[PDB]
Nucleic acid binder design. Structure first.
Lengths: 151, 79, 99, 100, 127, 114
RNA sequence: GGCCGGGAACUCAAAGGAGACUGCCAGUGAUAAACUGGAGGAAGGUGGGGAUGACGUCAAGUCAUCAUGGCCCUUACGACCAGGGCUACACACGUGCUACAAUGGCGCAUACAAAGAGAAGCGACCUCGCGAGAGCAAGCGGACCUCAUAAAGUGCGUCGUAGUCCGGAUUGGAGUCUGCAACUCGACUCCAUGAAGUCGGAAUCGCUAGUAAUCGUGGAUCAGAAUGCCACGGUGAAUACGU
């Protein structure tokens, strides 16, 4: 806004584990105010992912996120009558938010049967450095690299 | 319309039909009553039904029984 | 026996005045009463268009409130009942007596 | 509203009040089950000879000060415009502008 | 001896009585797991006893009415906080810092004339 | 399996499979299976010749396929020949049950013609 | 079983009161007005939402609510009646409802609300009908009786990516109720039928929090006739670096 200071809203932690990251992930997955459905889907997905890797659900989740977090991006400027792409850094909260959004968006487009299966497959591919989310990170970094002259 | 109520007819139309049948020969019967049912005792007569401007002649046959008199006289003109 | 009085009005100061009057007249005549009990108020609502011709927004909204009270008399006497029947209160309250 | 429409309404109310009982009796005959199966027919043929304006469904509510056929309220017997005028003048007990 | 608390949230009201010993919870003549089938509701109802380490030292008798699952759980939490305050009177600082002492005064916003909802407008066109 | 002059799918449940006949819906299908004594979630490929013949005998009690088609065609032709309001609508190609025509009516009209 | 004797504690009902004022603490600033932060507190700096519309602008809208200057018609531009029309249909535009599906469709059984209306009215229990309904008849001018059974949710089964166990336009047969009267032109029920449609070109709209999105419930007009309008509650987000 123009003359405002916006505080932070309090977010409850997860009921099974105790993380706020997982709560934010549930929130980004939910549709139409149906939180129980999203919780069920996420718990099923994490359960199926833990067996494929023999490590804890939280550790697998963090491993998946660390390969999707971005570092730099491009904004649009127009002062000389033309559109320029200006590279900027990304701050941590935005890094996490963008990673989560890209993971869910990639999962929804897959062709497996159930949403839990789609999410599990997408997370495993991300942990191995494959999939549309990782391709998106690559594209963003490429565009930011091709414009370092305007920094 | 409910079956426990019987069919609906106008009293004056019923009386006119009875008189025509009993007295034999008839010329067309003029009527403004488009909401009346067609009874079996009308077969063979000619009823002229109102449509807003004119009276349209309907020669009653046995496939028309049970319908209302107004379904054989359209009200709107279109080409 | 037992007597029940129901009072209704559009104005709560009027209703309270009348209730206190009834309580005092019952207590002075040698009886016992069970104090007035407030009962839920009724709110009726209306909504109208305020232009003689087409402007579908631009409405007004009105309300009428109906206040209600109940009083009970437990051990009456002939003089008390006659005194109650021979009384008149303000001209905006409705009183109903059940024996 | 024209002066003839109000007269029409008055006539309708009069006839509907005049013929109230006859109609109720005939309708009870027609409706009641286990009737003669011929009295029903006769009552059906008799109900339609009474005047048309004796059916209470031929009546239309109107404002009691102007005759308007639209925007009627039943508690007040008036239309919206007259309701508002009286309310602002203070001629309807208990009524006032509301907020919540 | 008993200790009492009253709690309120969106449209719900909750009465709570607490006594010492052998932690058992009864709500509307049923157990916690039978009444609330939601893990979020269970966690909310249990938060303050976990905060102040008295989970297995107090019996709780509770009644509630109005609202829905989340509102009832929140009202119960408020009531338990107040009852614990009555019981001890030195846990107020910790409960306040946790945030359980505040009444959450968020209600539903009314519908307004000319709008489809409290804040939603109909579609607009220039031409 | 051939039932009423047609083949019906063999990998579905019976209650779904029997609706491939023209004139048999969900309710009639349930009635047929109840009268024949076969469960509803049994595949048609897990049955026997005697059971299939029982089904044939039960299905024979309704009007289906060609007979029903002839019935409907005669129904419509009657009105068209009689020349009532409904018949005129039928042979003009417009709605019959009193729907609007200023807009819509595209299921009976077809796509637009400029 | 709040069923019964009782009790006046609590939830709730509705009348009188208390409370929030930059009042207290530190720093900044002109020995100011104010500003950033902290304590206690249910709530903090306009705590949230309503009502409340300055002098004037557009010869803006309304002589068909009503009233009114000037014109105009009086065996007619004024009465009365039955039938028809305002519902037409090659086409163009605005506002909405239902969908194109596994965060789903269908079957069984099981929690948790708020706010309203009712005597030419609201119509329980029981019997008959697959059903819309019908028959006989208590109670209530109502914190007591009735409308009235919340839904999304949760548990257990099945469907396995197909124009399908997705969608429900059209059309044929058989009925119910209101009403003198349902052809033109009503709403609803049963059996059968089973269209377009797989997320929408150039444009373009709403919303900063108990909001958007999604789920049900009530009223006015009213013999009958809402996907519109006016109200009520359940679940419940994302984001704001900056001009």
């Amino acid at each position: 806004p123009r003359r405002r200071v916006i505080g932070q809203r309090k977010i409850l932690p997860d009921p099974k584990f105790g993380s706020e990251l997982l709560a934010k992930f549930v929130n980004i997955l939910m549709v139409d105010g149906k939180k129980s459905t999203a919780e069920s889907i996420v718990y099923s997905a994490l359960e199926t992912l833990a067996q494929r890797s023999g490590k804890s659900e939280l550790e697998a989740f963090e491993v998946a996120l660390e390969n999707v977090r971005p570092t730099v991006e491009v904004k649009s400027r127009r002062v000389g009558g033309s559109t320029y792409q200006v590279p900027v850094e990304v701050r941590p909260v935005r890094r996490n938010a963008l990673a989560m959004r890209w993971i869910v968006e990639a999962a929804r487009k897959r062709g497996d049967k159930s949403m839990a299966l789609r999410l599990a497959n997408e997370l495993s591919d991300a942990a191995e450095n494959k999939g549309t989310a990782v391709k998106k990170r690559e594209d963003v970094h490429r565009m930011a690299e091709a414009n370092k002259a305007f920094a | 319309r409910s079956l426990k109520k019987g069919p609906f007819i106008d009293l004056h139309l019923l009386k006119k039909v009875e008189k025509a049948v009993e007295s034999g020969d008839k010329k067309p019967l003029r009527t403004w009553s488009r909401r009346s049912t067609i009874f079996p005792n009308m077969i063979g007569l000619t009823i002229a039904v109102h449509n807003g401007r004119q009276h349209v002649p309907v020669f009653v046959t046995d496939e028309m029984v049970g319908h209302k008199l107004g379904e054989f006289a359209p009200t709107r003109t279109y080409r | 026996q037992r007597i029940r009085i129901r009072l209704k009005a559009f104005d709560h100061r009027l209703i309270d005045q009348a209730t206190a009057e009834i309580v005092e007249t019952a207590k002075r005549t040698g009886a016992q009463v069970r104090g007035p009990i407030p009962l839920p108020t009724r709110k009726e609502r209306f909504t109208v268009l305020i232009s003689p011709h087409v402007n579908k927004d631009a409405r007004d909204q009105y309300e009428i409130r109906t206040h209600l009270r109940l009083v009970d008399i437990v051990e009456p006497t002939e003089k008390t009942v006659d005194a109650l029947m021979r009384l008149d209160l303000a001209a905006g309250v409705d009183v109903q007596i059940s024996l | 509203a024209k002066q003839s429409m109000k007269a029409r309404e008055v006539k309708r109310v009069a006839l509907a009040d005049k013929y109230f009982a006859k109609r109720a009796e005939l309708k009870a005959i027609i409706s009641d089950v286990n009737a003669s199966d011929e009295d029903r027919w006769n009552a059906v043929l008799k109900l339609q000879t009474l005047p048309r304006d004796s059916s209470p469904s031929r009546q239309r509510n109107r404002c009691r000060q102007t005759g308007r056929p639209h925007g009627f309220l039943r508690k007040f017997g008036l239309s919206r415009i007259k309701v508002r005028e009286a309310a602002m003048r203070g001629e309807i007990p208990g009524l006032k502008k509301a907020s919540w | 001896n008993q200790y009492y608390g009253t709690g309120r949230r969106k449209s719900s009201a909750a009465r709570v009585f607490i006594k010492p010993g052998n932690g058992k919870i009864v709500i509307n003549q049923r157990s916690l797991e039978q009444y609330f089938g939601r893990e979020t509701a269970r966690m909310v109802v249990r938060q303050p006893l976990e905060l102040v380490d008295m989970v297995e030292k107090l019996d709780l008798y509770i009644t509630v009415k109005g609202g829905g699952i989340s509102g009832q759980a929140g009202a119960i939490r408020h009531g338990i906080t107040r009852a614990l305050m009555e019981y001890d009177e030195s846990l107020r600082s910790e409960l306040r810092k946790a945030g359980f002492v505040t009444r959450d005064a968020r209600q539903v916003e009314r519908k307004k004339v000319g709008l489809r909802k409290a804040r939603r407008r109909p579609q607009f066109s220039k031409r | 399996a051939r039932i009423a002059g047609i083949n019906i799918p063999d990998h579905k449940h019976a209650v779904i499979a029997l609706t491939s006949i023209y004139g048999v819906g969900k309710t009639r299908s349930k009635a047929i299976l109840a009268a024949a004594g076969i469960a509803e979630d049994v595949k048609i490929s897990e049955l026997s010749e005697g059971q299939i013949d029982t089904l044939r005998d039960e299905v024979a009690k309704f009007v289906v396929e060609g007979d029903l088609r002839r019935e409907i065609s005669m129904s419509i032709k009657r009105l068209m020949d009689l020349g009532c309001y409904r018949g005129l609508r039928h042979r003009r190609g417009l709605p019959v049950r009193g729907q609007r025509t200023k807009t819509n009516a595209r299921t009976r009209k077809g796509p637009r013609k400029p």
